[PDB]
């Protein structure tokens, strides 16, 4: 019949999800500014999960590729930044939203 195309549908679910969790704790959900541009915590997390989880990509120091995926500047200490922001904000959001 008819078809569509992926857009900013789910990309929002991530924000509403991580938010609904933070807004509750007390501290509003804030996004860090990397590369003179807003960070898409949605893409980073998404990719990882796909790659093969956090422990996997982490063990294979794939962080490098995970960063370049978002068209990041190859040369700057980004890998570290990402891994951090994740375990910094995406740490509780995940561990909490893990296991139904």
Curated annotation (Swiss-Prot):
**What subcellular compartments does it reside in?**
Nucleus
> Where does the ARID domain start and stop, copy by copy?
8-98
Q: In which tissues is it expressed?
A: Expression is highly down-regulated in metastatic prostate tumors.
Domain of life according to the entry: Eukaryota
Task: Write out the coiled-coil annotation as residue ranges.
Answer: none
Report the domain remarks.
The JmjC domain is required for enzymatic activity.
> According to its UniProt record, which protein family does this protein belong to?
Belongs to the JARID1 histone demethylase family.
Query: Other notes on this protein?
Result: Involved in sensitivity to docetaxel.
Q: What does this protein do?
A: Histone demethylase that specifically demethylates 'Lys-4' of histone H3, thereby playing a central role in histone code. Does not demethylate histone H3 'Lys-9', H3 'Lys-27', H3 'Lys-36', H3 'Lys-79' or H4 'Lys-20'. Demethylates trimethylated and dimethylated but not monomethylated H3 'Lys-4'. May play a role in spermatogenesis. Involved in transcriptional repression of diverse metastasis-associated genes; in this function seems to cooperate with ZMYND8. Suppresses prostate cancer cell invasion.
What is its quaternary makeup?
Interacts with PCGF6, MSH5, ZMYND8, AR.
Would you tell me the protein name for this molecule?
Answer: Lysine-specific demethylase 5D
Species, as recorded: Homo sapiens
| Gene name in the database record | KDM5D
